[model samples]
Target: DQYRPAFHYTAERNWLNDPNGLVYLNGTYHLFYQHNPFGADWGNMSWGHATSRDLLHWDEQPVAIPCDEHEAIFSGSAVFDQHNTSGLGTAANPPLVAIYTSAYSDAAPLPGRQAQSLAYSLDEGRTWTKYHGNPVLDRASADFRDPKVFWYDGGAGSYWVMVAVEAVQRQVVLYKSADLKAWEHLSTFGPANATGGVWECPDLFELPVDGNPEDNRWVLIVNINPGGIAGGSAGQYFVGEFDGVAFHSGSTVTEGLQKDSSRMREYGWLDWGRDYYAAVSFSNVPDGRRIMIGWMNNWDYARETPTGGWRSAMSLPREVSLTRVDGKVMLRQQAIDPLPERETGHVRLGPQPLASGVLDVPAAASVARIDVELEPGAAAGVGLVLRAGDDERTVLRYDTSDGMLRLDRRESGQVAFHETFPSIEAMAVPLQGGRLRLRVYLDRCSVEVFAQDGLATLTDLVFPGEASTGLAIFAEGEGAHLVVLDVVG
Candidate 1:
């Protein structure tokens, strides 16, 4: 059971990436992922299917959409044609439409080109039929891909709007279609956001700010590689407004036209984590919650990880919303409520000085959730030591002087597989009211840290031996005062 994740969605075997075609219909949450059925390494990409009534427990389904003669299925989305709008569905059974990127192989018509294509399922996703007339939207550009389609409201009219990435150019191009098949260019949005690598998955949605369901603003999500805060792949977002046609950045825009140069100066990160990439929200959600999931592997060491049969997993499903922090609107992510497990109990720590340098939790669990609040009175810093024993442990530290959080795994357990795997990852999170609150989720071989009620996050994969299952809290210099500590399993 090496590197296996608990309570996280993963394939039974082979490779996975870019959670795709997420939709809710028929009382089920359908999750489709970029998959390679043939092996553990990346190749032969297609859509792998799974369903869950609750996001915590998943049931693997057959491959929903497979690689065909036209191309290998890349990232895209699914929508419920509730009104039978596309004419692909009937009165009795409405169609579920999937918009995806047909990444051309040498066997494809133009060899190396990519285009947007379609497929439909009438039986509520039990089966799918690729449209006979494929490549509904093609730009004749090799890098145009990852089409995220959604229904739009413009007060004047309603139509289908698609936001697709012009990868090399770092622009998100918008298109409008009367029918799902034909498309017309509308406007372009980026090169304004961060671009460490080619932009991939692009998703656009309207989210209410701070629980005000009636007051909502549009958010555009973009995923980039080699440019994440952790030196690999990660997601970034923009809080903006969208009419039926164009997108404008910031909370208020009457014209729906903001110059790219002006918007480039401002943006917010979706997750400050290394492992959370290609995150997209589900379509047609009934309760109106904006739920998102992401591929939980970093491309810097994804192929080199030691998993024998399968290579990747998905991050826990998160409920995303907008909240104002310091008068600035930012995205917040929290694990879905009722976390699929019961708390084994708690561990009380010091209201006294942590001068002993370590306080052991006295329990061994490969899967656990820990919460701690610290009052850094006169201390230099404080943090946690996880998967410790046999002189090995992963260090998660909060530096008081510089107000930064760091995760160092150079000696966690498994190294030497990749040089990039052992580096120390850090992100700045200034103290909120001069206190630190950390919520950590520890799976078999991974850890996700959420700071200040989801204001910042960090996720990374670790590969300690099975025997390594110890937990402890630590301090530096004068030592910190721990106010509360709770653990759940």
Candidate 2:
């Protein structure tokens, strides 16, 4: 259910942020989200509902939980009522429990702080009732919210775990509930080491590997403050043991490429666009594919989306899997097809041994773009005249000698923002035999690239001329070859 939401639902307006509890019901996938129904801006968060037969296409349900006096729902997870799992479903009633964190403020020192609450739906999301003891989990400290509930069958006993962010420390704390009504604190992670800012909407789970089907490992994620150490937000992973008592990350998982190591690893946001955050995965799927969906708008500019009624989107759903390379685990992302395609006419390149020149293509071709994968050859400068004609173009190049890829806009003449992004300069996803692929997509004023077969991506926003079609591609070294590319939508 977390896979990017489809066209129908998003066609509605307002703000859609994090993916809340995602569960597979009797015959469909039910996805709940953090939505602001009143306006395009986010606040007074409510739960918006949608159901899908396949993980892609969706049908909208009424706003499941209203932001009434009790508490505005923040974020949470859910489970299926197979045989009415929660006992809320019976001969007279059906068990459909929607556990979530209720965000509210009162006449107290920390008036704006929040607490966790729950509501249940009978007859499938048409009605609800909050548990008698609201604030089932509370930390009046202006902190603690977003509860993720799951029946942890990890050999201890069956109990519910509500994970929420503590506003003060900005950490993800684990809580236990013997019954769905009452919750107790367990342990905490992230925040202290995250060092980014407040961590929000956390999800923890284990992934299975190719060779070792029996190895069950855990992955902990936190949406961090953009502009932190990595310049934007990031998702962190920890591979360790989780019993009812405690969880541990004995070593840093980054050291070993394979996932089996009991360590921690991190991944950056999948999209280069301004809006992408707080993604979550479904607990179950009929196809047995582990699916993920993330909010397509960043928190910074989420409040904008004037023309499109809604202010957010979900990234294309990615099929997640792992590969064992040299005994280390690596996460791979694949665009679940049929991938939406558009032809920007033909993408071509010119003969080399020249510094620069004009590229002759239709003016309409300027805004449209394509990718070129370089077959191993003599190394030199390879770049495109991005957003061209009047010198607003930014050139992207790779220097095999220094093993770095650079994006420079000095020629178009804008003062560098300290330095161009991706300043780290490394091979865009290491290739096996040095064959490199470059996918360039040009939008109103943005360019995104996926290299190394989509394993690595480079996202940058540029302000090129609205009607400038003047474009060209040239290489400075000898034995260079350029070819045009074509795509059919």
Candidate 3:
């Protein structure tokens, strides 16, 4: 099991992408996604299934909805039809409705067309039956896909709302359905902010700002590929208001596609690293926690990833919300659920001068949770080296002078799979109490860093030597101090 994720969800075997139909029912969480049951490279797109109790470990289930010769199941969302709105089951035993895309193949009647379809699971997502009357919604386009549907309740009447994309057009086509079968066109939003790449996987929902229930804002999310801010595929969102009909954008840095993209600081990025993409949140979370998971391999190098069989892993589930940081109302993501625990969980040290340059810390597991805090004080920067061997290491340097946290993985072992695999991701992380605090989770093939406590996040995939398990702390100047170093493996 080489490069197997220690704490992330990976299919037992074959290719997987774009988490679909995330719904919580009873006391269990169900995860569905675009999967190819046949091979490790994407082809036979079907809805792969899994169940998670703690959201960290998952048990793979049989393919929920498989593809046929005529069409392939694509990305979408799922919801518990609490009132049996679809009439697929009784109110006391309402079925789980999954709204997914049907990517029609040439043998199908609507060849080259992508449209929304429906399926129902009466047995808590264990088995599904495709709706007899399908293509529930179609625009006669080849690119319309990734429908994220949710139940909308307000003064405008409670119904099901779907946010899907007209891919090449870069527009999110909104639709409202009363029975999850019939649909009425709502308003469309997009081709507005970042139109760098064709839009995919559109999601819209509201969240309480700073945990204030009375004060809330809707978040419109659209994932784009090829032209992500960090390159390849990425997810960006918008802070806005969503009425019963349409979404009104309240945050827009630059309209239309900006060649320079210099205003990225003001744009909402789900993660500033290259890996996380097609992020979709869960439905019917009992605690009302907006938890989401992303496919953790960029489309640019997705197929080329060092695959032993299972192709991609899902990003650590992140519970997302809105916080008014400074004057801007922005989205914040914190990786959720506790991870696998340890025999050597007592590796802790800190409150020491880092002026010695490179001080070796206790070796950490190839995959572990690491938290560190450092005060630059008079130093130029303070940071550490992780997954280090003689010549391979991943570095996270926080420069207080510029206030940018740089995650460099250029020298972290294998990077020759693709030309775009090696790069540095830097995010502006403001220090708290004059100290840089970072929480990083290192898996065999990836690194997740949360600075300023999830106000900012960077996730990148690195292929380092399995034996590269060394660790070190370093400072660029004499006045740097290590506030704390905690590693839980």
- Number of backbone clashes in candidate 3: 0
**Alpha-carbon error at 25 in model 1, in Å?**
0.8
**Which is the winner by lDDT between candidate 1 and candidate 2?**
1
Give the number of the best model, judged by TM-score.
3
On lDDT, the candidate that comes out on top is 3
Off by over 4 Å in 2: 1-11, 83-85, 91-94, 107-111, 126-129, 227-230, 250-274, 286-288, 304-309, 338-372, 381-428, 438-450, 457-486
Clash count for each candidate, listed in order shown: 0, 21, 0
Q: TM-score of predicted model 2? A: 0.75
lDDT of each: 0.83, 0.57, 0.88
Error of 2 at 120 (Å): 2.8
Candidate 3 ranges with C-alpha deviation above 4 Å: 340-344
Better of 1 and 3 by lDDT: 3
Summarize candidate 2's per-residue lDDT along 110-171 as a digit string, tens digits: 35657776677766665666666666667775657666666677776777776667745767
Models ranked on TM-score: 3, 1, 2
